[PDB]
Amino acid sequence: EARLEEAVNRWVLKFYFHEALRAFRGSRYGDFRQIRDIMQALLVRPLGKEHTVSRLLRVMQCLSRIEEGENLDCSFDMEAELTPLESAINVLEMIKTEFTLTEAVVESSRKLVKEAAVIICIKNKEFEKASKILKKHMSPTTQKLRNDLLNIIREKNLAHPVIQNFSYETFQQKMLRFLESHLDDAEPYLLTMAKKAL
């Protein structure tokens, strides 16, 4: 019941979380992935996990899924039948719960992820997947888009403005801004100590 290794592990987790966000923000996704992998390895160790660690990890989960979102070959679900962005949708719901966010606050960002999930499948000519995603998650306000995407899928029209104008870079950076807006902007202890040490 003791914080000793847990205390250091928390410091380490929060340090790499900070560095992962920093990397993602500078569009250094290679660095992000490397840091992600360190954090994955830490998860087996005692962290004294509570709601704040849980919150950090959900955000990290969502970003990791978004960073792999263009890679349809990979999966985060044991039911390895979900595209990365579909898993991202799932994590966003957990983020809504653990950050206690209103529907109004999350709706806009959920729409982006859903839009991206469908478009990425379309760009990869995975029309049946896009169709399933569109059905499952977009089945009132974004009617024009849902209908555009439905026609794009039916007609296999990758040439469409909706598809051609889509920027995954713009999308993922928008998601980071959203996710970061619900986090504390505190400098991690290890970084503070390193600055002191030089």
Partner: peptide, 13 residues
């Protein structure tokens, strides 16, 4: 039950 490395899994399988 499965621990944090599974329930809060960061990297793909």
């Amino acid at each position: 039950s499965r621990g944090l490395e599974v329930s809060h899994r960061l990297a793909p399988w």
